[PDB]
Symmetry: C3
Subunit: 90 residues, 3 copies
Amino acid sequence: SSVQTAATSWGTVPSIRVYTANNGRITERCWDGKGWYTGAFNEPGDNVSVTSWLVGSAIHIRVYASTGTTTTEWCWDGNGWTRGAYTATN
Amino acid sequence: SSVQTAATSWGTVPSIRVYTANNGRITERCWDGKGWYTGAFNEPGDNVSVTSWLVGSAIHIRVYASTGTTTTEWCWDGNGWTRGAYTATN
Amino acid sequence: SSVQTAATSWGTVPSIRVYTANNGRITERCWDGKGWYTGAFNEPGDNVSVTSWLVGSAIHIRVYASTGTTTTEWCWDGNGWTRGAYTATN
Ligand SMILES: CO[C@@H]1O[C@@H](C)[C@@H](O)[C@@H](O)[C@@H]1O
Ligand SMILES: CO[C@@H]1O[C@@H](C)[C@@H](O)[C@@H](O)[C@@H]1O
Ligand SMILES: CO[C@@H]1O[C@@H](C)[C@@H](O)[C@@H](O)[C@@H]1O
Ligand SMILES: CO[C@@H]1O[C@@H](C)[C@@H](O)[C@@H](O)[C@@H]1O
Ligand SMILES: CO[C@@H]1O[C@@H](C)[C@@H](O)[C@@H](O)[C@@H]1O
Ligand SMILES: CO[C@@H]1O[C@@H](C)[C@@H](O)[C@@H](O)[C@@H]1O
């Protein structure tokens, strides 16, 4: 019985983000080339996946957090985390 | 407890695909910048992972669906989901 | 019971790596345009995630292997797999 992780990265430094689901909550550890630190992402979830893409130099991250049959999308677009439009019928 | 997801994205629109393993089957939700919709992917599996790459504007997706110790690779190369050559001796 | 996988890919051949957690071990299957073959990676873990990035033509891979509350990072930077600096307090 283990924590569950999801990871994404970008650029050539690189930056890395690792999300960990643990006892119903998801937190984030970050690397920007100069040591690991705790990130701002903090949301409910028993399961996590992540994807990200660059528009020029700007990173955009989408985290999919699931509890039961409900998946919530969280969005990073250079400012804060916001709730995304994702829905599903589970 | 919960469904298990995998996500991939491409381009700068972006396009996003989210695969959800729910009670033994994997389904797909799709974003191409204009609203979420249900994709054609539907395959059995308790666990899912995904990767994708672009060739110019053409997306290629590989979904790894697992039940027990058998992982089946499903391929999108523009022309419907086809069974891939992946094997593993788990 | 059912194994858990994580997948990454790079280039446009492409190269693909699929990591499978089974019976407390994470193993690796590899594709680079010929056949699937078993990779060198083999480490303890009940859960796995992965990310990778190119610097020029050189691939760098990070595998996050979790057992219980402990996530260990394994790093490929062209010459072998080495333990990474990642830490967390789960
Ligand atoms: C500067 O903010 C850091 O990087 C962003 C890309 C996000 O991962 C955020 O949660 C983190 O704290
Ligand atoms: C612009 O809309 C935001 O970004 C898209 C890429 C999707 O993640 C969508 O659900 C989200 O609300
Ligand atoms: C175009 O429609 C959507 O995009 C393809 C790339 C696949 O994800 C397919 O299953 C889905 O229906
Ligand atoms: C051409 O072969 C197809 O694409 C490769 C990139 C692999 O995913 C392989 O297993 C699949 O059958
Ligand atoms: C050349 O070595 C192969 O490719 C590397 C990028 C790693 O995936 C390694 O485990 C594998 O055996
Ligand atoms: C040089 O540092 C290595 O690469 C970084 C991108 C991180 O994965 C770090 O934990 C690892 O030790």
